[PDB]
Structures are given as C-alpha cells and as structure tokens.
Enzyme design. Structure first.
Site, PDB file in Angstrom:
ATOM      1  N   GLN A 111      -5.270  -8.383   9.553  1.00  0.00           N
ATOM      2  CA  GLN A 111      -4.839  -6.988   9.494  1.00  0.00           C
ATOM      3  C   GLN A 111      -5.520  -6.226  10.634  1.00  0.00           C
ATOM      4  O   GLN A 111      -6.708  -6.416  10.876  1.00  0.00           O
ATOM      5  CB  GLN A 111      -5.208  -6.369   8.139  1.00  0.00           C
ATOM      6  CG  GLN A 111      -4.487  -5.050   7.853  1.00  0.00           C
ATOM      7  CD  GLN A 111      -4.713  -4.539   6.438  1.00  0.00           C
ATOM      8  OE1 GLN A 111      -5.755  -4.789   5.837  1.00  0.00           O
ATOM      9  NE2 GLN A 111      -3.732  -3.820   5.903  1.00  0.00           N
ATOM     10  N   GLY A 160     -15.316  -3.983   3.873  1.00  0.00           N
ATOM     11  CA  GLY A 160     -15.822  -4.169   2.529  1.00  0.00           C
ATOM     12  C   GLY A 160     -15.047  -5.265   1.822  1.00  0.00           C
ATOM     13  O   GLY A 160     -15.608  -6.068   1.075  1.00  0.00           O
ATOM     14  N   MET A 207     -10.895  -7.569   1.923  1.00  0.00           N
ATOM     15  CA  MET A 207      -9.536  -7.757   2.401  1.00  0.00           C
ATOM     16  C   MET A 207      -8.734  -8.442   1.308  1.00  0.00           C
ATOM     17  O   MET A 207      -9.153  -9.465   0.747  1.00  0.00           O
ATOM     18  CB  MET A 207      -9.513  -8.605   3.675  1.00  0.00           C
ATOM     19  CG  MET A 207      -8.110  -8.866   4.195  1.00  0.00           C
ATOM     20  SD  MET A 207      -7.340  -7.334   4.755  1.00  0.00           S
ATOM     21  CE  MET A 207      -5.574  -7.734   4.609  1.00  0.00           C
ATOM     22  N   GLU A 208      -7.576  -7.867   1.011  1.00  0.00           N
ATOM     23  CA  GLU A 208      -6.828  -8.211  -0.187  1.00  0.00           C
ATOM     24  C   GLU A 208      -5.951  -9.455   0.003  1.00  0.00           C
ATOM     25  O   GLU A 208      -4.795  -9.484  -0.424  1.00  0.00           O
ATOM     26  CB  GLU A 208      -5.953  -7.020  -0.599  1.00  0.00           C
ATOM     27  CG  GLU A 208      -4.862  -6.655   0.420  1.00  0.00           C
ATOM     28  CD  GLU A 208      -5.299  -5.633   1.463  1.00  0.00           C
ATOM     29  OE1 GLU A 208      -4.408  -5.012   2.086  1.00  0.00           O
ATOM     30  OE2 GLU A 208      -6.519  -5.445   1.675  1.00  0.00           O
ATOM     31  N   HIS A 267     -10.567  -2.061  -5.907  1.00  0.00           N
ATOM     32  CA  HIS A 267      -9.657  -1.724  -4.818  1.00  0.00           C
ATOM     33  C   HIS A 267      -8.848  -2.955  -4.405  1.00  0.00           C
ATOM     34  O   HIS A 267      -7.619  -2.908  -4.327  1.00  0.00           O
ATOM     35  CB  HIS A 267     -10.450  -1.194  -3.615  1.00  0.00           C
ATOM     36  CG  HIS A 267      -9.592  -0.692  -2.494  1.00  0.00           C
ATOM     37  ND1 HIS A 267      -9.224   0.627  -2.334  1.00  0.00           N
ATOM     38  CD2 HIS A 267      -9.035  -1.358  -1.453  1.00  0.00           C
ATOM     39  CE1 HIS A 267      -8.478   0.716  -1.226  1.00  0.00           C
ATOM     40  NE2 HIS A 267      -8.335  -0.464  -0.658  1.00  0.00           N
ATOM     41  N   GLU A 268      -9.531  -4.060  -4.136  1.00  0.00           N
ATOM     42  CA  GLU A 268      -8.823  -5.248  -3.671  1.00  0.00           C
ATOM     43  C   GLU A 268      -7.886  -5.791  -4.749  1.00  0.00           C
ATOM     44  O   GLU A 268      -6.777  -6.234  -4.457  1.00  0.00           O
ATOM     45  CB  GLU A 268      -9.826  -6.323  -3.239  1.00  0.00           C
ATOM     46  CG  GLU A 268     -10.810  -5.852  -2.174  1.00  0.00           C
ATOM     47  CD  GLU A 268     -10.133  -5.234  -0.964  1.00  0.00           C
ATOM     48  OE1 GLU A 268      -8.956  -5.548  -0.710  1.00  0.00           O
ATOM     49  OE2 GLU A 268     -10.783  -4.428  -0.265  1.00  0.00           O
ATOM     50  N   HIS A 289      -4.579  -3.867  -4.764  1.00  0.00           N
ATOM     51  CA  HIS A 289      -3.693  -4.242  -3.665  1.00  0.00           C
ATOM     52  C   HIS A 289      -2.695  -5.326  -4.058  1.00  0.00           C
ATOM     53  O   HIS A 289      -1.659  -5.477  -3.415  1.00  0.00           O
ATOM     54  CB  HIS A 289      -4.509  -4.720  -2.454  1.00  0.00           C
ATOM     55  CG  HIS A 289      -4.785  -3.644  -1.449  1.00  0.00           C
ATOM     56  ND1 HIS A 289      -3.814  -2.827  -0.914  1.00  0.00           N
ATOM     57  CD2 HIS A 289      -5.946  -3.271  -0.857  1.00  0.00           C
ATOM     58  CE1 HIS A 289      -4.398  -2.003  -0.033  1.00  0.00           C
ATOM     59  NE2 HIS A 289      -5.692  -2.236   0.036  1.00  0.00           N
ATOM     60  N   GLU A 344      -2.734   2.315   1.159  1.00  0.00           N
ATOM     61  CA  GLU A 344      -4.092   2.686   0.796  1.00  0.00           C
ATOM     62  C   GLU A 344      -4.188   3.830  -0.202  1.00  0.00           C
ATOM     63  O   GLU A 344      -5.051   3.820  -1.071  1.00  0.00           O
ATOM     64  CB  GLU A 344      -4.892   3.020   2.059  1.00  0.00           C
ATOM     65  CG  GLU A 344      -5.039   1.832   2.976  1.00  0.00           C
ATOM     66  CD  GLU A 344      -5.595   0.621   2.255  1.00  0.00           C
ATOM     67  OE1 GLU A 344      -6.329   0.809   1.262  1.00  0.00           O
ATOM     68  OE2 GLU A 344      -5.293  -0.514   2.670  1.00  0.00           O
ATOM     69  N   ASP A 356      -6.821  -0.814  15.391  1.00  0.00           N
ATOM     70  CA  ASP A 356      -8.248  -0.909  15.104  1.00  0.00           C
ATOM     71  C   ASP A 356      -9.007   0.335  15.541  1.00  0.00           C
ATOM     72  O   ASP A 356     -10.043   0.672  14.969  1.00  0.00           O
ATOM     73  CB  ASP A 356      -8.852  -2.134  15.792  1.00  0.00           C
ATOM     74  CG  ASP A 356      -8.400  -3.433  15.165  1.00  0.00           C
ATOM     75  OD1 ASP A 356      -8.011  -3.416  13.976  1.00  0.00           O
ATOM     76  OD2 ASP A 356      -8.438  -4.468  15.858  1.00  0.00           O
ATOM     77  N   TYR A 367      -6.677   6.459   3.455  1.00  0.00           N
ATOM     78  CA  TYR A 367      -7.234   6.241   2.117  1.00  0.00           C
ATOM     79  C   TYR A 367      -7.336   7.541   1.324  1.00  0.00           C
ATOM     80  O   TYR A 367      -6.783   7.663   0.229  1.00  0.00           O
ATOM     81  CB  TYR A 367      -8.634   5.627   2.217  1.00  0.00           C
ATOM     82  CG  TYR A 367      -8.675   4.232   2.786  1.00  0.00           C
ATOM     83  CD1 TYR A 367      -8.510   4.009   4.152  1.00  0.00           C
ATOM     84  CD2 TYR A 367      -8.878   3.134   1.959  1.00  0.00           C
ATOM     85  CE1 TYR A 367      -8.543   2.726   4.677  1.00  0.00           C
ATOM     86  CE2 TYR A 367      -8.915   1.853   2.471  1.00  0.00           C
ATOM     87  CZ  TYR A 367      -8.747   1.653   3.830  1.00  0.00           C
ATOM     88  OH  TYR A 367      -8.783   0.373   4.336  1.00  0.00           O
TER      89      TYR A 367
HETATM   90  N1  LIG Z   1      -9.647  -4.091   4.869  1.00  0.00           N
HETATM   91  C1  LIG Z   1      -9.105  -4.519   6.168  1.00  0.00           C
HETATM   92  C2  LIG Z   1      -8.351  -3.355   6.812  1.00  0.00           C
HETATM   93  O1  LIG Z   1      -8.052  -2.359   6.147  1.00  0.00           O
HETATM   94  N2  LIG Z   1      -8.119  -3.498   8.135  1.00  0.00           N
HETATM   95  C3  LIG Z   1      -7.166  -2.823   8.819  1.00  0.00           C
HETATM   96  C4  LIG Z   1      -7.188  -2.876  10.230  1.00  0.00           C
HETATM   97  C5  LIG Z   1      -6.390  -1.999  10.988  1.00  0.00           C
HETATM   98  C6  LIG Z   1      -5.572  -1.066  10.330  1.00  0.00           C
HETATM   99  O2  LIG Z   1      -5.142   0.031  11.021  1.00  0.00           O
HETATM  100  C7  LIG Z   1      -4.020   0.584  10.481  1.00  0.00           C
HETATM  101  C8  LIG Z   1      -3.729   2.042  10.795  1.00  0.00           C
HETATM  102  C9  LIG Z   1      -2.549   2.644  10.339  1.00  0.00           C
HETATM  103  C10 LIG Z   1      -2.415   4.039  10.365  1.00  0.00           C
HETATM  104  C11 LIG Z   1      -3.460   4.839  10.855  1.00  0.00           C
HETATM  105  C12 LIG Z   1      -4.635   4.241  11.330  1.00  0.00           C
HETATM  106  C13 LIG Z   1      -4.769   2.846  11.302  1.00  0.00           C
HETATM  107  C14 LIG Z   1      -5.513  -1.048   8.926  1.00  0.00           C
HETATM  108  C15 LIG Z   1      -6.303  -1.916   8.180  1.00  0.00           C
HETATM  109 ZN   LIG Z   2      -7.161  -1.088   0.941  1.00  0.00          ZN
END
Ligand SMILES: NCC(=O)Nc1ccc(OCc2ccccc2)cc1
Ligand SMILES: [Zn+2]
Ligand SMILES: [Yb+3]
Length: 610
Positions: free
Chosen positions: A136, A268, A270-271, A295-296, A299, A318, A375, A383
């Site tokens: 992810q 923390g 990953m689901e 939380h996980e 998901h 989220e 990222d 969230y």
């Molecule tokens: N728990 C792992 C996790 O949530 N990683 C992850 C890594 C990148 C991601 O970015 C998604 C995004 C989508 C919308 C706004 C900001 C960021 C979303 C999730």
């Molecule tokens: Zn989540």
C-alpha cells in the site's frame, strides 16, 4: 462516466481486468531479489483488444509468454514514483469478456520500494535474514507486473521458494509446504486467496517465524523471542473479531492471524487479508494499544471488502474503519471511552491541519493525487476527518444504533466492489431517504472538498478527557513557585490512555519552560514509561522544550524502531533543536542504508537531506 486512476500507468478496468494471479517465485537473500513468474489471468472489457499496459517499478523483465510462445513487449520511460509502463502486444486480438493467461518472467531490484531486506543482525534471533513487503498504496508494481490500482480485484495463488530453515507467509490461506525439487537447500510454501482483493493487499514475509494459537481462528506469528509477549498483548483479538462480525456482517476471510514484524515496520498495522501485520511497538505489556488491532480487524469489511476505487477516495477506507474501530472499543470499554477516543482523534486532526496548513490540498477529505506520491501525502487526515464526518452524521441522523444500521447495509451493498465518494453518498441518501432534509443540511462541498478543519465539530462527551485537560492546564499556567505543588499523586486516577492524552494536550502548547519539563520528570518519572505512544509524546515535549538530556533518548527511539508515526516527528524535532541538529542528520546518514526504503525517503525529505 468511467473513472481513471491517476496513480497507475496500467490499462484501466474499462479496458481489461485481471481476474487471477498465480505467482511462482524464489526469494534470494544473497542477491536481495525475488525471481519468478507472474501468470495473470486477464479478461478483455473491449472488442478487438490487441495490447495492454501493466505497472512495473524497478523490475527486470526476462520474457512474456502467451499461448506457450514469447510475445513482444516494451517498457516505457520511468515516470518517477509511478515506475515504468509495460506495454504487451497480444498475439491474437481478444473479443469482449474473453480471458487469456499472460505469464511474465521477472526479477525485483534490491531497492524495491515494496520490500525491506533485513540482515541477521537486524532481527531478534541474529542468525537468519528476514524479508517483508508493504504494497500500500502503489508498491505492488515494485514486486510484480500488475494493474496496480484498487479499482481491480483479483484472486491469487502462490508458490514461494525459500531457504529451508525459514518460513514464508502471505495474505492468504496456507496451502502446505514441500522441499524445492530444483534446490534441496530450499522449501516451497503454497498459498491460496479465494476472495477477490485489490493488489495492494498482496503481502509476503519470509523469516525464522514461530506461531502460537490465541483464538479459534487466530495464530500469532513472530520470531521466537516475541511470541509469548505477543500472545498476551493480543489476547482480546477473538472478542474483537466477534464484535466486528456483529457490526459488519460475517467474516469471509477464514483465518485472522497476526504477524508481529521487526521494529522497522513502517506503520502501526497493515490489514493484509488472513494475516494482519503489526508493529512491535504495540507490545506495551498491558494490552493498552489494542485499538490498532481493532482497526486492522475492521478493515476486513471496510477496505478489504468495500474498497476505494482510486486513492483519491482513501478516506472511504479509513474513515469507516476508524468509525468501526471506535465502536469495538466502545463495546469493550463503554460509550464514554468511545467519546474519549473520538475527541482525541479530533485533536490529532487539529495537529495535522496545523502541520500542513489550513489551506493545504492534503487537508481536503477527497484529494487529488495526480502527480503526487501517495507516501508523501499520507497523513491522519483521511482517518480523522473521515471519522469526524461519520460521527457528525451519526449525531445528525439519530445516534449510533441508527448509523451502525447504515454501516452494515453499506458493507453489504458494496462487498467485493471498489467505489467512489459519490457511490457512498448516493447510498447514504438512498438508505436515509426519510431523512434527506437533514442530509441536505450538511455542507457537503465543505466537508468533502474544502481544506482545513471541518465546518462543524461534533458533540463529544468530556467525562474522561476533563482530568487530562485540567492537569495540562495546571502545568501550562504554572509559574516557578507553583512547581513544588506537583506530585506523583497527580497521576493516581489516570489510565495510560489518560496519561497519553495529558501529554498530547500539553504538547499542543509546547514549548514549556525547561524548568517545568525537568520538574515533570522529577515527579512523574515519564522517562520510565515504555509505552511507545506515551514515550513518543513525552520525548517530543522534552526536545521541543529544549532539554538536552532527552536528545540521546529521542535519537535512540527514532532509530531502534521505524514506525513512521514515531520516527519522522522525532527526527524532525531533533533537526529543529539547534543542539541536536547536526547529530540528527549524521544519525540519519548512518542509518539510511539499513532503513525501510519508504521511511528513508521521507525522513530525508523531512531533514532536507540528499
Ligand atoms: N497502514 C499502511 C498504510 O495505510 N499505508 C498507506 C500508504 C500510502 C497511502 O496513501 C494514500 C493517500 C490517499 C489520499 C490522501 C493521502 C494519501 C495510504 C496508505
Ligand atoms: Zn486503516
Ligand atoms: Yb506565584
């Protein structure tokens, strides 16, 4: 009315759709590569389809085979974090709905952004190496060629060859193990995932893993030295699964195992279906950080069953998951506790909006990730702004029992599908047809598309928060001659959660005078607390208040684990403190090569290094 995923370079779902992946690969720790074949069963969505494009990132392609013969393909120029598009020329034009199998021979790069390779020294046992993936949002393309978009869902099977002393696990049901016929030093582990998933939920771990059963459908996995502590820490897992099933509907995934990873795991949790990954920083010894498991677990419905169609709509994943999360905690510990955690979440939303700036594009609920690396955009906003909207709607529409009815109907409606915000809103209006006048009163444009804090803050019960606020305000308004009045008895009636909120409240007004911080350590002995969330906030408070004594403690926590929630703010605080700045940079430089690739990238950006 078709949608486009601006984070993917592959053919969209409107053109073709991957139905199944059969992965056969070997994990080579000597070369730090995964080598093998990805056979994609693809279904044309168009007449006369003669080519298609897949996502790749730092992959080496040997050949592409269809119908038993090699076919032509071309890798396009790299487009930064998105990787390189891989166009494949089909040998025979396909009619609509026709399916074929495309077998791609590939090898990953040692620098794959999806993977962290750990030396034996980086593990608990110190004898064997260790590999884990984190796909992810868009890193699956860095493991294998695929349509790397959540708008496509596929089943998968896999065979993974690893050194015989190691164990492989995946986001799937275990399907046996045998010696590898082509190399007796190796073992092959097999896996089956029968429920269609987006490719970001494909996961692999390889290492010296042991398991202990902790529930009727749950094993905990980790290296030997963490098994006993993990089994105790996560013992409430089945009771949470039970509550989640009550709220979301049946658990369709079979097993719910937990994997506790090495300290460098970047999040923390990953689901990953069938096998949730968690950070070892949850091992507080008293089960106090169990909301991450809640939380996980959640998901398994919101995210894994109902999935965001593109990452622009991540809040759908989220917001609903946090909403369910806090209901699990509410059922376990009471409604006043749910309101406490909700109110804390508003506080985290405040921090994030203040960090980004109240007009910043990433403080919108629905975002536009065109030419933005996910990222870099990642934050608490989807969230907590997402939760805040749902919590606001709960209170507008008649309360938790009524809104939980919507939640369960929503999961039921969109199970096994990928959806947009407009899909969600359309169903919200459908479901609450008899309350549309109430729905039309919410400022949809502001909530969904405007930056900053939401246009309206929900109502929160303050019962459990009041003591935290009162004590924080005593410290902030204290002058030197008031410091004597503070004593260990101040904390007598506070839970660990309340101690954490006290620190969060106080950190929001940091810096405090150095003398106050020294007195706080003198009477509360926060240096002694191992709870990762408490220690994180305490150390931030110390560094932002310019206590040089805390510098080594902050540097230690920042490097001995790698959860980005902790590591990034600690490094950034250390960088901003003039006394620790040079050492913070030096410490990043020394550790960079051995950090998780994503974490290394982001800390570097934070520190303005390289
Ligand atoms: N728990 C792992 C996790 O949530 N990683 C992850 C890594 C990148 C991601 O970015 C998604 C995004 C989508 C919308 C706004 C900001 C960021 C979303 C999730
Ligand atoms: Zn989540
Ligand atoms: Yb005074």
């Amino acid at each position: 009315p078709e949608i486009v995923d601006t984070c993917s370079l592959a053919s969209p779902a409107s053109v073709c759709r991957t139905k199944h992946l059969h992965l056969r690969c070997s994990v080579d720790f000597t070369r730090r590569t995964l080598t093998g074949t990805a056979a994609l069963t693809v279904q044309s969505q168009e007449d006369n389809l003669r080519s298609l494009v897949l996502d790749t990132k730092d992959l080496t392609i040997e050949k592409v085979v269809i119908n038993g013969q090699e076919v032509k393909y071309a890798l396009g120029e790299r487009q930064s974090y998105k990787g390189s598009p891989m166009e494949i020329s089909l040998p025979i034009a396909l009619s609509k709905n026709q399916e074929i199998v495309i077998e791609i021979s590939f090898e990953t790069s040692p620098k794959s952004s999806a993977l962290q390779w750990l030396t034996p020294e980086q593990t608990s046992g110190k004898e064997h190496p260790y590999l884990f993936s984190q796909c992810q949002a868009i890193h699956c393309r860095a493991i294998l060629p695929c349509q790397d978009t959540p708008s496509v869902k596929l089943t998968y099977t896999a065979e993974v060859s690893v050194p015989k002393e190691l164990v492989a696990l995946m986001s799937a049901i275990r399907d046996g193990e045998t010696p590898d016929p082509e190399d007796p030093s190796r073992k092959i582990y097999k896996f089956i995932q029968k429920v269609p998933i987006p490719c970001y939920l494909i996961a692999l771990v390889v290492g010296a893993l042991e398991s202990r059963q902790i529930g009727p459908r749950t094993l905990v996995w980790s290296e030997k030295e963490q098994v006993e502590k993990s089994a105790y820490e996560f013992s409430e897992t089945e009771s949470m699964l039970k509550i989640a099933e009550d709220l979301g509907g049946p658990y369709v995934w079979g097993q719910y195992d937990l994997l506790v990873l090495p300290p460098s795991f970047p999040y923390g949790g990953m689901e990953n279906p069938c096998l949730t990954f968690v950070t070892p920083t949850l091992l507080a010894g008293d089960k106090s950080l169990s909301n991450v498991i809640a939380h996980e677990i959640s998901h398994s419905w919101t995210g894994n069953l109902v999935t965001n169609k593109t990452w622009d709509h991540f809040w759908l994943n989220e917001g609903h998951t946090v909403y369910l999360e806090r209901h699990i905690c509410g059922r376990l510990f009471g409604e006043k506790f749910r309101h406490f955690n909700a109110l804390g979440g508003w506080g985290e939303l405040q921090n994030s909006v203040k960090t980004f700036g109240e007009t910043h594009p990433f403080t919108k609920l629905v975002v536009d990730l065109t030419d933005i690396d996910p990222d870099v955009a990642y934050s608490s906003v989807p969230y907590e702004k997402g939760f805040a909207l749902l919590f606001y709607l709960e209170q507008l529409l008649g309360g938790p029992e009524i809104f939980l009815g919507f939640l369960k109907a929503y999961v039921e409606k969109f199970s096994y599908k990928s959806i947009t915000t407009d899909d969600w809103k359309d169903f919200l209006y459908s479901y609450f047809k008899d309350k549309v006048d109430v729905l039309n009163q919410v400022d949809w444009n502001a909530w969904l598309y405007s930056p900053g804090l939401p246009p309206i803050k929900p109502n929160y019960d303050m019962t459990l928060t009041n003591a935290c606020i009162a004590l924080s305000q005593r410290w902030i308004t204290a002058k030197e001659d008031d410091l004597n009045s503070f004593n260990a008895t101040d904390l007598k009636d506070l839970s660990s959660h309340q101690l954490n909120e006290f620190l969060a409240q106080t950190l929001q007004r940091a810096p405090l005078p150095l003398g106050h911080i020294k007195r706080m350590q003198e009477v509360y002995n926060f240096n002694a607390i191992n709870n990762s969330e408490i220690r994180f906030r305490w150390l931030r408070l110390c560094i932002q208040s310019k206590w040089e004594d805390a510098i080594p403690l902050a540097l230690k926590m920042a490097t001995e684990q790698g959860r980005m929630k902790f590591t990034r703010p600690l490094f950034k605080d250390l960088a901003a403190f003039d006394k620790s700045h040079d050492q913070a940079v030096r410490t990043y430089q020394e550790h960079k090569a051995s950090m998780h690739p994503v974490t290394a990238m982001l800390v570097g950006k934070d520190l303005k290094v390289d």
